[PDB]
Design a protein around this ligand. Sequence first.
Ligand code: NAI
Ligand code: NAI
Ligand code: NAI
Ligand code: NAI
Lengths: 315, 315, 315, 315
Amino acid sequence: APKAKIVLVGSGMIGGVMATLIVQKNLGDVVLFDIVKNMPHGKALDTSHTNVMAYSNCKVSGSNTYDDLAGSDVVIVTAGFTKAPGKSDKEWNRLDLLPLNNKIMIEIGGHIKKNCPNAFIIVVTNPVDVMVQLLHQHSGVPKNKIIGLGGVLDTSRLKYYISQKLNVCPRDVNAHIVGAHGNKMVLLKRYITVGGIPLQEFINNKLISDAELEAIFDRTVNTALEIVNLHASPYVAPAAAIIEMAESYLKDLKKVLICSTLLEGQYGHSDIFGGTPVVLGANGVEQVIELQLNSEEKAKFDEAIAETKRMKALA
Amino acid sequence: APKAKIVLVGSGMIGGVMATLIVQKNLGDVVLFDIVKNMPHGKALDTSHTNVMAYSNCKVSGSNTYDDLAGSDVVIVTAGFTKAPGKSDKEWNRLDLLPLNNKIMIEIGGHIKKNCPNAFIIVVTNPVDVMVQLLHQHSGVPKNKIIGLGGVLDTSRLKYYISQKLNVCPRDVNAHIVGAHGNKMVLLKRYITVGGIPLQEFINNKLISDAELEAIFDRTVNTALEIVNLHASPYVAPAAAIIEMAESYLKDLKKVLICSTLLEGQYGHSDIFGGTPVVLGANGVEQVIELQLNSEEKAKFDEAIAETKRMKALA
Amino acid sequence: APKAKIVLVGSGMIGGVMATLIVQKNLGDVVLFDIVKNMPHGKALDTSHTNVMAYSNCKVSGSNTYDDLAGSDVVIVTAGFTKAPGKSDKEWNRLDLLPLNNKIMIEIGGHIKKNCPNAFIIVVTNPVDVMVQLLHQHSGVPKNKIIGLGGVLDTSRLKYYISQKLNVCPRDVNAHIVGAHGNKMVLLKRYITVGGIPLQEFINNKLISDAELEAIFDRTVNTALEIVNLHASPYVAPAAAIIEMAESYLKDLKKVLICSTLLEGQYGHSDIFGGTPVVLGANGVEQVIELQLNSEEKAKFDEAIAETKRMKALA
Amino acid sequence: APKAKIVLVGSGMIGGVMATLIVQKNLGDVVLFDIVKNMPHGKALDTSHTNVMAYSNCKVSGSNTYDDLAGSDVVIVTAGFTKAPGKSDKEWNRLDLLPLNNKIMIEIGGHIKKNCPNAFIIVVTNPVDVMVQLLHQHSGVPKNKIIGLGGVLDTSRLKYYISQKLNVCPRDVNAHIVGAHGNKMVLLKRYITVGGIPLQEFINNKLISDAELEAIFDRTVNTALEIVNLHASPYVAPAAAIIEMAESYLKDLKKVLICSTLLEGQYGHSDIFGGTPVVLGANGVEQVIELQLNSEEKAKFDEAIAETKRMKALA
Ligand SMILES: NC(=O)C1=CN([C@@H]2O[C@H](COP(=O)(O)OP(=O)(O)OC[C@H]3O[C@@H](n4cnc5c(N)ncnc54)[C@H](O)[C@@H]3O)[C@@H](O)[C@H]2O)C=CC1
Ligand SMILES: NC(=O)C1=CN([C@@H]2O[C@H](COP(=O)(O)OP(=O)(O)OC[C@H]3O[C@@H](n4cnc5c(N)ncnc54)[C@H](O)[C@@H]3O)[C@@H](O)[C@H]2O)C=CC1
Ligand SMILES: NC(=O)C1=CN([C@@H]2O[C@H](COP(=O)(O)OP(=O)(O)OC[C@H]3O[C@@H](n4cnc5c(N)ncnc54)[C@H](O)[C@@H]3O)[C@@H](O)[C@H]2O)C=CC1
Ligand SMILES: NC(=O)C1=CN([C@@H]2O[C@H](COP(=O)(O)OP(=O)(O)OC[C@H]3O[C@@H](n4cnc5c(N)ncnc54)[C@H](O)[C@@H]3O)[C@@H](O)[C@H]2O)C=CC1
């Protein structure tokens, strides 16, 4: 069948929500692959029944066999750790996931190269900007066929917090967070709009203040940590963000979505992956949009990339 | 039942598409009211069967009785003429619909006042900015409970044409057209974004030129005329625009949508209706957003309002 | 792009609603082909703008060129007449459309054979059971790649009328109408269920009577005539039925839908098309389900096929 | 705002998926209430961001305060244990949850009575048929305003397994499981249809055998145990089933759905809750449908009710 085959490499919390959303949207057949025995089968069985409630027809299978990557149209990688086994939630940091997740990406890359070299790849494993390039290199896929999750999620948080202060539909607030997904993420105040109107107009009208926005910015950057300390490493929004990206690709929607992508000169950077708006369609990353950042914004972008480069040196 | 009752006053081309979309979206029960005998019943019967295909449960009834407005939660007025009975399609102009549709609005207003004074009203009949105020005055409804169709439709055309040149998802282009729905509509080049990014960046990158944009602007303004000369007064997009507005109201989405609304000082105008972004939610027009227009843009806005004022004088 | 290309051969009332629904559902690119100059372009332009309201990305183009069938994944044929130019609405009969639509099918078949021999074809033009076979023969497509509209529409009417008497969700009533789409359609009382429960149980409980059901049966058979006399040849429900079929094919849903399909022994008939439940998926007509009809029901089926055979003899 | 307020009493695995699906479908505002400190806030925060990806506008709040039940339109109770703290997964049984969950229902009932006596209640906590009546009595709500989850979930499993053997859309298989949700659930072979066609026809055609169906029946009954031993107490399908019920109520769909409801003579039983098809609409349980079971099926139903009665005696 010409229905898309979507392989979720990693069947944990995010993997579970992704499978659920894929069935709700009838996006394609799903394989919940994981290193843990039987669990993926259990989740798959549970999720497969929703086809009835959703009026869909998507097969949902579990797997503990890498070769099931064969024939994959889309591969979503969440495989790895959410935190370092010994740190407290208070000291939670994506950087500490570097020595834990690196070897996993190499292993997965080799299987992708052998089994589904023409698949569209979405990397989620943290530190994402480092992990995505590691997988790009080991999988051998073209630069337009691999992206990392970052901006769609970070901006969803920023967009949401602003929409609640202004009392407008969440999707009506558009915003851009670039550079890298982590504590050095670059929140672009200048590029925020509400109903397509520059945010500064709402600031001028005393509808939202600069002080409130600064607090919203800090909350956005610290959201993962805030949720990690309240409950666990976030998974619902991450899953929804990923599926919006996967959906744009599968349905050729050509949505402008901020993702980690290979930079080849944009922002003065090359040979590294960084967050920037891209257009996702049938041909993968169809366009890499370079925001005409001012020097102050570019300095922040450089600081974000510097972090990715530091961890890429695996130190 | 607490399901919303939506009365479509006018069951012509736009009325037909609206009923179809309401059932697709399961928005509420529908009454296709019209002055023409039996036709509304025929359309209603045809449309009611789609409940099966759509997995919905919306009653769709025809009516030739004004009293069926009783209990209406939303009233959409398309009643009237699409053109003046004697003009050629080449000389098609919304202004000529003034002497034809004025009496119709007064009649409908009286029935709304008597039967459903608490309903949310959406006026479509042209010249819309004039007709909406006429209905506002005769229906007695509060200013936050009545709007006219204009900007959502005009901008859909502008957004679409730009999305095809740039190869991005149509919804990713945001744009604003204000003042009035007609030949004096104000297309705000300064307020156009793509994926939330200022359009000027795409112009700077030679992705779209100023000359191409100027051609797109003219096409947008002349779209109705272009379609009227190819086929008929547009109805599919108008219907979709109206339902997006009605849906924002019914589901309390709080979308920022450009509609004709009573101006009370915005842009230096009062006691007149004009197109401007508003927030539509459960309380109707919850916010009227005034774009901080520059003098050049304001001069264009004044020219648009001048036209509405001229026809309002019924001359 | 791998997005499906859907060619609507005939851009009239049904064609218009189909294009609208395809965009709402983001099913694929649409070509509104017609013999009438410019009209398809006008409708296409109008419909294309809805991509904005619908958050979709489907191209909608008009055409007056048969070669645009090239590359078509799905071809929906509505081309032809809705009534005979001289009969009154009171004497409206699908049989009189035979001498009007036959030549049209042959012409379209030749173009399909040359331009898109691997496309999935849905024939709507009346008398449908005759027209579908005529197109099958002239297009050269495999038997599993062509079907005619009939049962999904006829049953939607029967299902709907019963759901309103019993006060249940319309989709919860399942029913089967077979043989042919026309005055000899076979309404199978024995195969009606409500929430999967045999209808006879509701009849036993005095929730609906046999007399009421008999009236509902007559209304179902005469629905097209009833609407034709109130308004025009039905188009909204027909369009929704067609899209449900096209959607089952495109998304590999494998829905059991009653359509006109080539009979090869089922019900004792061969070399003729007749209405019967089929399973529509990625491989087209994946299964032809033969209802184990009793002799009384089979006698009615024979009467329906007899009519198709009579008109097939073009008399 | 007139948007529905949905209180999820219990914010565990099922609660999490429900909140996610409510936002996807824009069903209403959500309160994730739980006894565990901070966790509901974390899940709510995570889920609230999806409003962006889903184009919805549903508030999602966490709570550790019972009074937040005030103003609730729908209350979904999942509060309790999934297993007895000391049993192995191999010996997992819903009956052992009786001494653990009883006190919880009484406590919740008192709060519902005081805070939202007019809310529609959906009980999920196991053993569900016992728990729902316990909550009915302590909450004081009318019999038409409270139901327990059971049949929609059990049948989703049966419907699914059959659809995969027959290669048809999962929703096209309709089936009925009654009496109680547990090991004594009554699978009604006689009431199974495929595309509305009696299953026996497919058995006659050698498309599926009686032996295969018997294996599918056993798998359906043991599904929860199978998943519990592979992964954990199922939550994705349960959540989807619950939301389909809640949605039928909120949108007045009037779907026929099998749920645990107060029996007042049906099947020869009174003063006890049992699984049976009901019609869920704006007025709650609008109809209780009694299947005209034969003596053999009724004997099985009696065995199911006997179990509920035994545990109701809290022994
Ligand atoms: N890029 C972004 O914006 C975000 C990144 N993340 C990251 O996503 C990753 C996953 O998050 P969760 O799903 O919450 O974690 P989780 O721990 O729930 O799931 C990860 C799964 O990966 C599995 N795994 C380990 N090695 C495997 C391998 N070789 N192949 C397949 N599966 C394997 C584990 O058994 C586990 O089931 C983490 O690194 C997390 O930090 C989380 C949110 C957002
Ligand atoms: N505001 C905007 O953005 C747009 C405005 N329009 C306007 O919408 C109006 C309707 O357009 P269509 O649906 O294409 O026209 P149409 O001619 O197809 O339908 C109008 C219907 O109103 C009926 N009618 C007349 N008096 C009536 C009354 N007293 N009460 C109820 N029904 C009555 C007519 O019988 C007719 O069926 C026109 O004035 C058109 O110019 C069209 C597109 C966009
Ligand atoms: N099978 C079924 O269940 C149903 C069948 N019908 C039939 O569908 C057909 C179409 O119905 P409507 O859309 O309401 O009619 P319509 O008259 O609105 O549209 C038919 C279109 O076909 C065009 N046409 C004629 N020759 C053409 C050709 N060579 N190629 C392409 N286009 C050409 C006409 O110009 C016209 O625009 C009719 O025969 C009608 O009887 C209608 C409802 C249900
Ligand atoms: N009726 C049916 O068809 C099905 C029933 N179930 C039942 O649903 C229940 C919940 O299942 P899961 O969500 O997987 O369990 P879970 O353990 O993940 O979640 C239950 C939550 O209830 C909380 N809780 C305890 N007392 C509370 C109170 N007084 N008020 C509010 N929250 C409180 C717990 O802290 C926990 O977070 C279980 O009894 C399970 O057996 C599960 C599937 C289907």
